[PDB]
Design a protein around this nucleic acid. Sequence first.
RNA 1: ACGAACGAGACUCUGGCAUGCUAACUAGUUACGCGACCCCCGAGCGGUCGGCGUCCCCCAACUUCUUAGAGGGACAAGUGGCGUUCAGCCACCCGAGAUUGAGCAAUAACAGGUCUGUGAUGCCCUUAGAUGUCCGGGGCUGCACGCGCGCUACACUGACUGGCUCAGCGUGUGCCUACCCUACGCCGGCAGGCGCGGGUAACCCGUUGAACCCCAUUCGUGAUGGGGAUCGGGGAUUGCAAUUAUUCCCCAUGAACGAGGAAUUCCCAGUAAGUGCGGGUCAUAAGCUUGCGUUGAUUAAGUCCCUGCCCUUUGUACACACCGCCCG
Lengths: 141, 52, 141, 53, 75, 127, 57, 57, 137, 12, 191
Amino acid sequence: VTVKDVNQQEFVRALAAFLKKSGKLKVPEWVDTVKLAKHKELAPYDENWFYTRAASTARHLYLRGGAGVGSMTKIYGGRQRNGVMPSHFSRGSKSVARRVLQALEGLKMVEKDQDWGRKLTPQGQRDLDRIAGQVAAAKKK
Amino acid sequence: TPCGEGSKTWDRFQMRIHKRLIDLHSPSEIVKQITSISIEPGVEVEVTIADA
Amino acid sequence: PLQSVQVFGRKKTATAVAHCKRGNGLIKVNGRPLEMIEPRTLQYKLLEPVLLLGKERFAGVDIRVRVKGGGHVAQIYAIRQSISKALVAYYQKYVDEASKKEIKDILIQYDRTLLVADPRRCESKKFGGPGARARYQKSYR
Amino acid sequence: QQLYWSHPRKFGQGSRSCRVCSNRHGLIRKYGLNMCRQCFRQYAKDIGFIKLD
Amino acid sequence: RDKLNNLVLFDKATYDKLCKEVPNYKLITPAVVSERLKIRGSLARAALQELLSKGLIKLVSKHRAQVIYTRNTKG
Amino acid sequence: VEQKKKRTFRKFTYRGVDLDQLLDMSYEQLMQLYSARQRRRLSRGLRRKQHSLLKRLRKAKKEAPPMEKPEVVKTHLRDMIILPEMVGSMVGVYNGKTFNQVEIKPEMIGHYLGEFSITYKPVKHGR
Amino acid sequence: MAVQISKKRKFVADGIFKAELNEFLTRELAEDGYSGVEVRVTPTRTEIIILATRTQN
Amino acid sequence: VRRACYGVLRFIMESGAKGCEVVVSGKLRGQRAKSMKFVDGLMIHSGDPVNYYVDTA
Amino acid sequence: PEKFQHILRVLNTNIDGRRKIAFAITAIKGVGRRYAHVVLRKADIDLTKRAGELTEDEVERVITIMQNPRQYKIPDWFLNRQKDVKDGKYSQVLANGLDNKLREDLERLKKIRAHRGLRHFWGLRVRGQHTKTTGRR
Amino acid sequence: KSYTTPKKNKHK
Amino acid sequence: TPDIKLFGKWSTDDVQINDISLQDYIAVKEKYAKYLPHSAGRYAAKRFRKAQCPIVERLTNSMMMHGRNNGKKLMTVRIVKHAFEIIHLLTGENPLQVLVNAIINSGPREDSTRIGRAGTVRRQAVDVSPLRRVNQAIWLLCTGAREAAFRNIKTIAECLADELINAAKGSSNSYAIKKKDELERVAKSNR
RNA sequence: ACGAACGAGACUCUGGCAUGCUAACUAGUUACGCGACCCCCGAGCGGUCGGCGUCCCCCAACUUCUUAGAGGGACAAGUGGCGUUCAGCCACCCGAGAUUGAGCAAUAACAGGUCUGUGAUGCCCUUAGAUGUCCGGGGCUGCACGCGCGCUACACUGACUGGCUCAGCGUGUGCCUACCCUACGCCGGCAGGCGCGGGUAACCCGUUGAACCCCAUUCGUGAUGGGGAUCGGGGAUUGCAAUUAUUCCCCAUGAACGAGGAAUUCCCAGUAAGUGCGGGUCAUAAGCUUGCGUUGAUUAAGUCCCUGCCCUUUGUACACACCGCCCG
Ligand SMILES: [Zn+2]
């Protein structure tokens, strides 16, 4: 099937499962000391963070290829409560998503887009679209 | 309020502007020849191969 | 042409354009799966007409919709208006009156609210008040 | 001179003058005019801005 | 402050009563446990998941607000 | 603060090197020791406003015997990182209105003079 | 003007000059009656028509 | 001022009009403020057509 | 699980058995939620469990892990004390070493007459702190 | 501006 | 007008009247039904269309009062259907009819105005219009559902379901069911 | 009484019925030629159905949608009731049913404010030890109280991290003389260092791949991971220079608070409110302004009882009009 017909969240969760068990996807450099878009004042708790974040950058590349830090951290971000201040938006972790893109661009599941960016390979497309049919025929939520 | 106020006042200043564009495939001269009917009203006419 | 219908629809401002198309019978909103706009609470919402307009009349339609603007449920009524707006001409213009008779009536048999949406919109803030009608409070000494 | 001039003016809001009254109690450079609104409500019929809201 | 003294950690006698008494109604919720018997809410989550492990109940709801576990004459 | 085990051994070792090696030091390590704000002031230079002073600082230190103290140098200004060689002086700053004499302490160095000399001059009060 | 700017600030410059010349002519040339002016801009031209009760001024 | 504003009115009604309002302010004697005002004809006040249908000055 | 332990004895400081491991280790001097999770991840000690049934084995482990970070190098910018006013080194401080060091720094300021060291003679907030009618608790 | 009573010597 | 009226969990017809004096104000078949209620308040045309506005839509739209909570509407309706399910589970029978009879049993009866006979503020009892009655019942049971999940443990849906249990199926078990006797005895002695 | 105006109606914008009108290779489309690339993606692992913000070079093509010119709606228009069928009012079929709101702008005048928007401007004033002028430091931001305008909440519909579900407001490169809107990868964690590049703007950011609605997740009615300051320790960042934190970021400091008695405002409909985002100030920049925008509520369709315009009768020592005269 198409990777749209699977649930968006379980698509990325099982994408993280596949890449994690393949062990290739970047394992964390420091698990809980990441500030992760400092609008997220607290920390990430479990070492299954980078799997999902890189998987989701790959999925947003599927949504549209050739993206970048400014145009992916925008959707990755959200709302923050600012103590004695109101809420603005200033996207945080740049090198986390950059290292996502590097760890997959050296992996040739995301390839160079024209003039800049990270575009999509037939290999990444085929792998993710197989896992899509896998998950869809399996149970779902 | 110039300087005599007792409350909050906020006016506005709005305008009407436009950019209206013909797009023709002729040489640089026959366009001059065919065009003489735009300099009757006041609207800035600029004829160029590429964008002005 | 003479074989499909591609016209618009919208809530206050969220605008979709639906195209009912001759084929095998398929439904797709945003060029994405039907339910899977995923409000995840209004999972019930956009299959009421789909299961109450005639499962037979949902057998030949290949719905493709191009959408943008505003908010989520606003875009939901955008598509819900757009699909009806296309199929009504799909039935009246290209096709006879008997085919019209069923769905023209089912229009209000759901509700007349769908052919044309609200003539409403949010309008400009009026100063001296934090919204459209309220007023900044009047203080003393 | 060793005492006279040491200050290029490139700072704050009253750096660049209102052209007509040059009074520095707050100015603006939306479209480069750098001119008071008490001035602009007097000369915008000639600038091109006329109220029609 | 003046507190209900809902038991704060896992509790021997309450663990027995939980294990063989609780999955028996048509309404189950960690807060329901913590106000019917005495327990903290995550504790009720843990004992509820212990009873789910055996599977003495059929689910009805699944929400962050609460979940509902209903009787299957199992427990 | 600070009891250097007095009668001996001056020790203001801020940031982890020693003062008897820091009086005679270099700007590179001095900048990597000064905080980010001092470093940020230094990353645009200590321009002539303080050169014309430091010349008189050295002049004062040489002319006045070390068995006395060097002369009081006055600054129209209020913002200056206390350098390694100006330990042990007495200098009268201008708070904007009045000359206030400030005593170089060996535990001031590495901050700005306008915090030791302020200008919201202590108010009198009432009801 | 000499910096080849967008149509926004270009129309704005046009109006800036209309303004910057109106009161100039009114407070300069009013040794007579005074009526008004009218400007317009055409290709490789820009023509300004002055209107007052002494052609000779 | 009054015998001159009568002349203003007379000349504009010579050239043909439909309504006018001429108002002057200022002390014609001493220390206490005064102003005077002449009106005749039709003189619409609200609405948009004032600026382009009376040529205010 | 069934309660392994109860009221604990940490860093020579008593803590909350009320909250779990991490969010009751935040009840320590010099620690937060962020520090609690970071140190427990560096020490490889459980989160899904609770401190009220956490064993003093895995309390003394955590103590010896927070006490000397440089042995494990939890990054120094994560280690509160740093680049201070005398004899600077890099580490993290906790139970009453924080009071000792904040004390010592305070006497430095108090003796030397900085502006903050004088607004603690005036009992207020160093900056910016309008106080005319505003902001006096 | 010159709030002061002395402006010691503007004389050349 | 559908071929079957269902919620995906139980039925949508089988709604009636219990105390006829409120007929045509509790509405379940105005002109349609939905998978789950949602509206802008479209029935705001008059007093009459909000008098005969559907009850499930009435309560689902009404339960967003305390400000920013209409700023979380999807999850709030999740809560309302949760609470209806909680009733369906605890007490069994269909929660909508039970809430119908609960509004009936927790409706007020009279309201006393302030007309001083010789100057001192007194009260005088007028028969509560049945619409204001049903609205007092629903929109003070909502007040109780907030006063419960504000100063208790139970969540919004659980509080609401407990109230709809113990309103018709219990006496003196609601903030509304005490407001009722207060108002009616006030009306008696303040006639 | 007649023949007359101005103020209201008129004079404009905005939002809304437009499946018919008008065409943009500088806009989109592109329905058409899954054609060229793509996966077999899937049951099937084939014919084809599904998804490419993937391209076609352009001398193919159109404005469904799209920014909108004119054409053109809506006027109690009809009728069910009332009047006197006067001018009209509630309702329903034709549905957009009147009126969506924003604007535009009087006569007498207050002595209310404007000479510190001005070289608008009369007197007199400062006129070489300046109130003209360039500059440096301080002050306009100091705190025992009172007040208003105010942001953040008082936590369980709390909410923590992670995913993905969803725009239009407008400015956008030297100016009337100094700094214009964006994006890519290489590093430190973010702040922050790096240089190649798009753009005078339906070209480009941006199909603004916008949040709070969403959900997994949790400990558990515990000043509690909340409401989250204070202050400590640093890091960069503009600037001639941030010291009484001007801004940004972290470790970390962890506080005053349990929907508040004294008075009062606001709105009865995409309207309150929740609310991320724009735009004005700039070397620094919003809890303010004023717009964009969403998830969208309680009851209300009456009445002058409380504060308030206009009307008529009608007493008045009041003529600066009840804050007035006024009396022993
Ligand atoms: Zn000006």
